[PDB]
């Protein structure tokens, strides 16, 4: 009856009783980190809350109902969907233009939770026209607390890739990200770059739109930002770009991206080490001049070091970086690899339980021997000298057909 009385009092003609009841509902949803959302929905309070959103004559009541609806929309998809089905979104879009700042901001917060539910709720709110008035809040005078909520909604607008947001929405969001990437607040900068990382993870056409925005020269130097939160997001965003074409990759390289990577391969955090090698693996998958840029940047010995001593996640990306180079590189670039003693630590990975890593190393060794027309003898002994030949022989006993067939063909052709 406590919940039932609160619902009845939320429709009271007495304004003091009505405001107190909506507050009591809000506090049930905000007093702890396990709110009773389903109980309040079944009590019948949703249509009353959506209804208080129209009370322009009582801003205090509008604010409390928007707060209560914000927390209901923060729950499961079914609970977020109940707020949608109550037709609250058109009223939240109304309140973006409220003269009262706390009402306007809470409506942004509520819409962000609905947008964050998934692509279909995102596209419903987009269809009603949320993006333009949202970006209109970006101004010199906006409070910093409010702007952090605005950039959080922008992240939610970019974050679902199945499907990505419509192209028109991306073309509206990108000029706003170009403004925000120069902000000195760390949280806004982190959100801005994560938003870019979601847009660059959406395919090559979206990558080109990010490039055409002109934002890449202002993104690459963030690889050496003091804050590791910014570095991690920037490494992800530029890492996604270099998954595109050779030209798109060259744009990132022409912003001096490789200069930042000595400090990234030696960074304290293993996660940055792994993503940095993953980045480089996509450069050694490029053309021969991009392979040469990695060589000229003196990054190969640091890759081979992590291939040997790094954690298994990083060693895995390092094997890809080496194996990619054996497919794209010239003979003199692969010879540079042999001179840097890639053979022993490369072969040491042949005994791991990850069948993909074993296949990557076997593919690389096959390409190395096929490429060294005259020096295949020297390389063949180097492989046996470190115990690699013994490991190739036992991989003939492997469960995977692609692996044991390649082990057979390697020994027949070169041993």
Partner 1 sequence: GKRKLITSEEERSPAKRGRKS
Q: Does 282 bind partner 1 (CB under 8 A)?
A: yes
Tokens read off for 4: 């039932």
- Vertex 70, ends 68 and 75: CA angle to 5°? 105
Per the CB < 8 A criterion, the answer to whether 62 and 55 are in contact is: yes
Give the Cα separation of 200 and 208 in Å (integer).
Answer: 9
Q: Does 270 bind a second copy (CB under 8 A)?
A: yes
Q: Does 311 bind a second copy (CB under 8 A)?
A: yes
Q: Which of 12, 15, 30, 266 binds partner 1 (CB under 8 A)?
A: 30
DSSP 207-259: HHHHHHTT-HHHHGGGGG-S-HHHHHHHHHHHHHHTTS-HHHHHHHHTTTGGG
Q: Which of 85, 145, 339, 397 binds a second copy (CB under 8 A)?
A: 145
CB of 282 to partner 1, least distance (A): 5
CB nearer a second copy, residue 205 or residue 270: 270
Give the Cα separation of 23 and 14 in Å (integer).
Answer: 14
Element (H or E) spanning 167, and its range?
A: helix 167-180
Per the CB < 8 A criterion, the answer to whether 15 and 50 are in contact is: no
Number of residues in the chain:
415
Size of the site for partner 1 (CB under 8 A): 46
Q: Which of 320, 334, 350, 358 binds partner 1 (CB under 8 A)?
A: 320
Axis-axis angle for helices 204-212, 167-180 (nearest 10): 40
Q: Does 144 bind a second copy (CB under 8 A)?
A: yes
Axis-axis angle for helices 331-339, 355-371 (nearest 10): 110
Per the CB < 8 A criterion, the answer to whether 155 and 195 are in contact is: yes
Per the CB < 8 A criterion, the answer to whether 95 and 104 are in contact is: yes
Give the Cα separation of 165 and 169 in Å (integer).
Answer: 6
Q: Which of 2, 32, 268, 373 binds a second copy (CB under 8 A)?
A: 268
CB of 85 to partner 1, least distance (A): 17
Tokens read off for 275: 């993503």
CB of 390 to partner 1, least distance (A): 28
Axis-axis angle for helices 355-371, 312-328 (nearest 10): 30
User: What would the x/- binding string for a second copy be over residues 381 to 400, using CB under 8 A?
Assistant: ------------------x-
Q: Does 327 bind partner 1 (CB under 8 A)?
A: yes
Give the Cα separation of 393 and 136 in Å (integer).
Answer: 66
CB nearer a second copy, residue 270 or residue 332: 270
CB of 44 to partner 1, least distance (A): 21
Q: 13: Cβ–Cβ under 8 A, 6 or more apart, which residues?
A: none
Q: Does 64 bind partner 1 (CB under 8 A)?
A: no
User: What would the x/- binding string for partner 1 be over residues 239 to 258, using CB under 8 A?
Assistant: xx-xxx--------------
Q: Which of 27, 51, 55, 218 binds partner 1 (CB under 8 A)?
A: 27
Please choose which of partner 1, a second copy, none residue 270 contacts, taking the beta carbon within 5 to 8 angstroms, the exact cut-off set by kind: a second copy
Q: Which stretch binds a second copy (CB under 8 A): 4-12, 125-133, 240-248, 263-271?
A: 263-271
Q: Does 74 bind partner 1 (CB under 8 A)?
A: yes
CB nearer partner 1, residue 9 or residue 113: 113
Contact footprint for partner 1 (CB under 8 A) = 27, 29-31, 33, 35, 67, 70-71, 73-75, 80, 106, 109, 112-113, 116-117, 152, 155-156, 159, 190-191, 194, 201, 229, 232-233, 236, 239-240, 242-244, 275, 278, 281-282, 285-286, 320, 324, 327-328
Contact footprint for a second copy (CB under 8 A) = 76-78, 144-145, 162-163, 186-187, 227-228, 268-271, 311-312, 353, 399
């Amino acid at each position: 009856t406590s919940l039932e009385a609160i619902v009845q009092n939320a429709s009271s003609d007495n304004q003091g009783i009505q405001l107190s009841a909506v507050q009591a509902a809000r506090k049930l949803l905000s007093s702890d980190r396990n709110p009773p959302i389903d109980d309040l929905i079944k009590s019948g309070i949703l249509p009353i809350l959506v209804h208080c959103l129209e009370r322009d004559d009582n801003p205090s009541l509008q604010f409390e109902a928007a707060w209560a609806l914000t927390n209901i929309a923060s729950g499961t998809s079914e609970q977020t969907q109940a707020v949608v089905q109550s037709n609250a979104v058109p009223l939240f879009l109304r309140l973006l233009h409220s003269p009262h700042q706390n009402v306007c901001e809470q409506a942004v917060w509520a819409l962000g939770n609905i947008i964050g539910d998934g692509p279909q709720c995102r596209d419903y709110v987009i269809s009603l026209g949320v993006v333009k008035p949202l970006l209109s809040f970006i101004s010199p005078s906006i409070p910093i607390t409010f702007l952090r909520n605005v950039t959080w909604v922008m992240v939610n607008l970019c974050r679902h890739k199945d499907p990505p947001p419509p192209m028109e929405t991306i073309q509206e969001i990108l000029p706003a990200l170009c403004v925000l990437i120069h902000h000195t607040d760390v949280n806004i900068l982190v959100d801005t770059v994560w938003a870019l990382s979601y847009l660059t993870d959406a395919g090559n056409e979206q990558i080109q739109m990010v490039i055409d925005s002109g934002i890449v020269p202002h993104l690459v130097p963030l690889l050496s930002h003091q804050e590791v939160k910014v570095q991690t997001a920037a490494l992800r965003a530029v890492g996604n770009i270099v998954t595109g074409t050779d030209e798109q990759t060259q744009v990132v390289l022409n912003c001096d991206a490789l200069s930042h990577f000595p400090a990234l391969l030696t960074h304290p955090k293993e996660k940055i080490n792994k993503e940095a090698v993953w980045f480089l693996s996509n450069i050694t998958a490029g053309n021969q001049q991009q392979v040469q840029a990695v060589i000229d940047a003196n990054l190969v010995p640091m890759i081979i070091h992590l291939l040997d001593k790094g954690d298994f996640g990083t060693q895995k990306e390092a094997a890809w970086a080496i194996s990619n180079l054996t497919i794209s590189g010239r003979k003199d670039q692969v010879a540079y690899l042999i001179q840097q003693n890639v053979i022993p630590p490369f072969c040491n990975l042949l005994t791991v339980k990850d069948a993909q890593v074993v296949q990557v190393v076997l593919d690389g060794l096959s390409n190395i021997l096929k490429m060294a027309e005259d020096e295949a003898e020297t390389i063949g002994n180097l492989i046996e000298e470190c115990g690699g030949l013994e490991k190739i022989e036992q991989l003939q006993n492997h469960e995977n057909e692609d692996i044991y067939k390649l082990a057979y063909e390697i020994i027949d052709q070169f041993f």
